[PDB]
Amino acid sequence: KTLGEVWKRELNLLDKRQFELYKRTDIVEVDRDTARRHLAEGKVDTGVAVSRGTAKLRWFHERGYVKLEGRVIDLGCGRGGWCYYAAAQKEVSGVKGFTLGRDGHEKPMNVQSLGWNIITFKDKTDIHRLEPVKCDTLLCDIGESSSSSVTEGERTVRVLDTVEKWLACGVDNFCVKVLAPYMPDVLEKLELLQRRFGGTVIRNPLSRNSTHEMYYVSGARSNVTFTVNQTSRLLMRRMRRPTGKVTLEADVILPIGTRSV
Ligand SMILES: Nc1nc2c(ncn2[C@@H]2O[C@H](COP(=O)(O)OP(=O)(O)OP(=O)(O)OC[C@H]3O[C@@H](n4cnc5c(N)ncnc54)[C@H](O)[C@@H]3O)[C@@H](O)[C@H]2O)c(=O)[nH]1
Ligand SMILES: Nc1ncnc2c1ncn2[C@@H]1O[C@H](CSCC[C@H](N)C(=O)O)[C@@H](O)[C@H]1O
Predict the structure, then answer these.
(1) Residue 178 β-bridge partners
(2) Of the candidates 127, 92, 121, 118, which has an alpha carbon nearest to the alpha carbon of residue 109?
(3) CATH no. for 1-261
(4) What is the domain partition of the chain in residue ranges?
(5) Which of 77, 87, 125, 199 has the fewest beta carbons under 10 Å from its own?
(6) How many Cβ atoms sit within 10 Å of the Cβ of residue 181?
(7) Which residue, 111, 120, 121, is CA-closest to 49?
(8) Is the CB–ligand 2 distance for residue 202 below 6 Å?
(9) Atom of ligand 1 nearest to the CA of 211
(10) Which residue minimizes the CA distance to atom 26 of ligand 2?
(11) Does residue 260 line the site of ligand 1, with CB under 6 A?
(12) CB-hemisphere CA count at 13 Å for 141?
């Protein structure tokens, strides 16, 4: 029924070439070449990002969609791209990242970009069962894509359900991935969360067209259904005649070193 649900259905009908072209059509992409080479050779002091996630969070942060301050908690940190980005910001005092890091799930990577010493990584942790703790900035980048819209809806509502427990503790800032903002139950949960905690959902330009993910952030407030549909309209427009044309941009390079007294 929603424009987004139609989008998912049409997405699944695309042929191999069209899907490949479609996913990167008119999107922005950071050049990960140098970063990947450094990481692969064991370099930990060049300030390169451990994943594409660092650039994603930087985009939100640099334009006020989320302030990174004080005690930061990163649910589903994976390799740690968001933890390292937050750790390098002066306003941040500490970072706790939690992730599964098991059975194929990315484990935290160890590099020494600025503030690596203020991050405490913990793997083998299912954040749905992790007891909420008080923090100032809450981050969560969880949401596994599924060809089934019903399934993406279920996974998204589960993430928001868990995240609400943490926001309820009282947080100033947040940036939470919403896998399928186009699903009706999700739209309603977002409207309820907005009334309780404020914020709104924003589409990151670094996201590929093959996913409708948007992020629930604290730095702005807008009409949820309107903006989710604006993104649905954009995604459907790009599916008409995929060019695979991408805009390459410089990846994030952070300063290096420990943050000491
Ligand atoms: N028409 C197509 N749609 C595709 C394809 N691969 C993915 N998708 C769609 O994009 C969505 C995002 O894909 P992404 O690779 O970024 O996320 P996942 O790694 O979690 O993909 P899954 O949703 O987990 O799918 C697993 C695999 O299943 C295959 N798959 C998934 N959907 C399809 C379809 N519709 N047609 C053909 N083959 C399909 C494909 O090889 C996928 O890699 C996915 O949920 C699908 O709705 C594809 O080859 N063709
Ligand atoms: N229930 C759960 N508990 C903890 N971690 C989970 C989880 N479900 C998924 N994850 C992890 O969440 C991560 C999402 S990808 C996160 C990327 C990160 N923002 C970066 O910048 O690198 C994956 O590693 C996935 O394994």
Answers:
(1) 214
(2) 121
(3) 3.40.50.150
(4) 1-261
(5) 125
(6) 30
(7) 111
(8) no
(9) 12
(10) 105
(11) no
(12) 22
